Amino acid sequence: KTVVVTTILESPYVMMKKNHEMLEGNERYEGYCVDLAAEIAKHCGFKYKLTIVGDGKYGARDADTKIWNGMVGELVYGKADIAIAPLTITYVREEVIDFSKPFMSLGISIMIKKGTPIESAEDLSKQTEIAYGTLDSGSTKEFFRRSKIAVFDKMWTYMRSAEPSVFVRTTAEGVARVRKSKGKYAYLLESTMNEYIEQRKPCDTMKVGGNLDSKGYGIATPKGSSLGNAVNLAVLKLSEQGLLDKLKNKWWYDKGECG
Amino acid sequence: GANKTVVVTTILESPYVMMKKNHEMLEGNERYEGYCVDLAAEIAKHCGFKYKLTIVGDGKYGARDADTKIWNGMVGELVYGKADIAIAPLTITYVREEVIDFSKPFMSLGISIMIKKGTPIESAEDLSKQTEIAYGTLDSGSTKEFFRRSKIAVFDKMWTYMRSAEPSVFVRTTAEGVARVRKSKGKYAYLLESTMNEYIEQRKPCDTMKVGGNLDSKGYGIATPKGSSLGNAVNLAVLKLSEQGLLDKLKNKWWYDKGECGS
Ligand SMILES: CCN1CNS(=O)(=O)c2ncccc21
Numbered sequence: 001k002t003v004v005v006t007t008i009l010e011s012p013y014v015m016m017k018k019n020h021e022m023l024e025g026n027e028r029y030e031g032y033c034v035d036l037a038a039e040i041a042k043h044c045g046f047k048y049k050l051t052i053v054g055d056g057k058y059g060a061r062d063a064d065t066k067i068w069n070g071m072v073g074e075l076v077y078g079k080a081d082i083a084i085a086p087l088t089i090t091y092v093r094e095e096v097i098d099f100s101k102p103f104m105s106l107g108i109s110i111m112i113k114k115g116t117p118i119e120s121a122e123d124l125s126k127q128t129e130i131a132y133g134t135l136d137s138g139s140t141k142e143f144f145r146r147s148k149i150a151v152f153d154k155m156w157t158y159m160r161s162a163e164p165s166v167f168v169r170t171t172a173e174g175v176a177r178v179r180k181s182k183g184k185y186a187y188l189l190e191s192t193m194n195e196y197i198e199q200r201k202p203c204d205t206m207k208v209g210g211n212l213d214s215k216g217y218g219i220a221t222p223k224g225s226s227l228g229n230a231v232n233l234a235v236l237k238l239s240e241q242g243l244l245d246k247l248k249n250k251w252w253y254d255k256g257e258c259g
Numbered sequence: 260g261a262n263k264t265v266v267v268t269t270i271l272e273s274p275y276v277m278m279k280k281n282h283e284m285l286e287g288n289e290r291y292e293g294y295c296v297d298l299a300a301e302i303a304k305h306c307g308f309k310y311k312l313t314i315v316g317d318g319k320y321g322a323r324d325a326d327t328k329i330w331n332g333m334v335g336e337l338v339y340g341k342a343d344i345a346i347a348p349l350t351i352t353y354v355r356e357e358v359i360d361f362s363k364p365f366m367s368l369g370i371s372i373m374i375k376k377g378t379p380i381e382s383a384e385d386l387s388k389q390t391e392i393a394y395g396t397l398d399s400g401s402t403k404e405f406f407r408r409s410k411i412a413v414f415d416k417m418w419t420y421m422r423s424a425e426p427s428v429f430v431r432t433t434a435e436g437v438a439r440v441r442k443s444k445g446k447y448a449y450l451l452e453s454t455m456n457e458y459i460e461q462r463k464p465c466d467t468m469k470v471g472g473n474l475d476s477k478g479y480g481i482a483t484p485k486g487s488s489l490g491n492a493v494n495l496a497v498l499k500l501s502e503q504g505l506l507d508k509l510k511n512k513w514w515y516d517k518g519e520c521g522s
């Protein structure tokens with residue numbers, strides 16, 4: 001029957017089409033992950049229904065209740081059959097759900113308003129005039145929380161107690177905060193999203209420094225799902241045919257507005 | 260039953276696995292050093308097994324004979340039950356995933372171009388549009404298969420040339436490709452993984468360089484026979500080492516910290 005796909009509104013991965021209010025079902029949406037879902041479904045031979053994750057989150061486990069939220073929770077608790085989204089492969093998630101081989105590479109990166117005197121994470125950690133933070137309920141925040149790497153641990157110690165909160169509910173809110181804070185806020189986000197925004201009007205942000213880590217997004221399934229093997233082979237087939245590169249070029253470079 | 264020493268297949272490929280100085284008087288795992296030797300030790304510690312490193316007999320990564328359908332190389336060692344795990348720069352591919360299991364990648368790479376410094380080549384398109392400079396790949400690996408299978412015009416054109424070139428543009432080992440670049444006065448370019456390319460660019464006599472972008476994007480994984488009980492633990496260990504920053508430290512250790520071409 002119809003495979004329930006959980007995904008998340010995150011540009012350019014999944015976006016509402018122009019005039020979506022008169023559209024229905026999968027046709028409401030467009031983007032990299034919408035295209036990828038169609039390709040994966042064709043290769044594996046299933047029909048599917050795109051559903052936007054109810055709580056709008058990627059997935060974290062509450063320290064006390066030990067309940068998972070976000071897309072990870074939807075998989076864990078049986079609300080969706082598969083997640084096709086910019087969902088980061090991590091140790092803690094691999095303990096509770098399955099991931100395909102990665103379909104896209106990324107690392108944590110720094111976004112600044114152009115002209116901000118920051119070149120690195122070390123720079124951020126050694127000052128206090130420029131505030132910085134991350135997305136809530138995602139892998140970037142969990143990276144800093146868990147990290148024993150000295151610069152990142154120092155950064156976490158500042159971020160977790162900063163007032164007002166330096167954490168944001170959505171990627172778009174982080175970007176807006178960079179753009180509105182006259183250089184006094186820098187946002188820690190994945191290189192994929194940073195690079196997309198850097199090529200969008202008003203062309204006032206940039207990625208500075210190297211990436212802080214190296215990882216990937218995978219297609220996720222509940223542990224022991226029958227779909228896992230076919231989905232993994234489909235990712236590798238699309239990779240080897242060059243279609244993942246084509247999709248990246250379509251939704252990043254072609255979406256470029258800054259010349 | 261009782262714990263058994265895990266047989267690890269690997270390959271003599273610098274800087275992943277190399278003969279130590281004084282290897283002639285050393286035994287067992289102590290004979291070897293490198294990135295994958297260090298990685299093996301970390302994986303074994305995390306998963307709680309003892310192991311024996313064994314260099315693959317035929318010195319190949321792994322390809323399936325089109326006629327006999329027999330796998331050679333490290334892939335073959337796993338398929339036919341001669342090794343329990345491969346800890347090596349073994350590329351994750353579709354055809355290999357059909358017959359063995361891979362961890363999540365522990366290193367990223369892409370196919371790339373190695374030239375002798377000063378060679379007037381900047382891209383694969385450049386190579387494809389001329390005949391003065393020969394070019395080829397390693398035998399029995401994923402780079403050769405990439406060109407054989409590609410439907411992208413430039414890479415297909417490159418394959419049509421390479422497959423029929425005389426004398427043969429293919430090499431049996433990475434070292435042979437490097438020698439051919441170094442000795443051919445700019446008239447041979449070598450197609451190899453970016454990891455290997457970047458390593459050699461930091462070795463004396465500092466006469467090669469990587470040019471252009473990478474032609475694809477993939478990774479190396481730790482491989483096990485299909486359905487092996489080791490796979491889950493090994494995968495979690497790769498991800499833990501990744502998150503801890505240790506894979507990045509190992510890359511720096513073996514590529515750059517003792518690079519020979521300056522700071
Ligand atoms: C080698 C670090 N790494 C860690 N393993 S991973 O999260 O599957 C991943 N995916 C894509 C690129 C790199 C990568």
Ligand SMILES: CCN1CNS(=O)(=O)c2ncccc21
Pocket residue numbers: 101102103104105216236239244351352364366367368476477478479
């Ligand atoms: C996203 C392309 N890709 C394809 N899947 S892969 O071979 O597991 C891989 N590993 C590391 C980095 C990239 C990568």
Ligand SMILES: N[C@@H](CCC(=O)O)C(=O)O
Pocket residue numbers: 058059086087088135137138139140141188189190
């Ligand atoms: N890709 C992340 C969300 C973005 C972020 O945390 O920066 C995740 O899967 O949690």
Ligand SMILES: N[C@@H](CCC(=O)O)C(=O)O
Pocket residue numbers: 320321348349350397399400401402403450451452
């Ligand atoms: N890593 C490759 C070998 C090197 C190459 O083909 O360039 C493999 O696993 O086949």
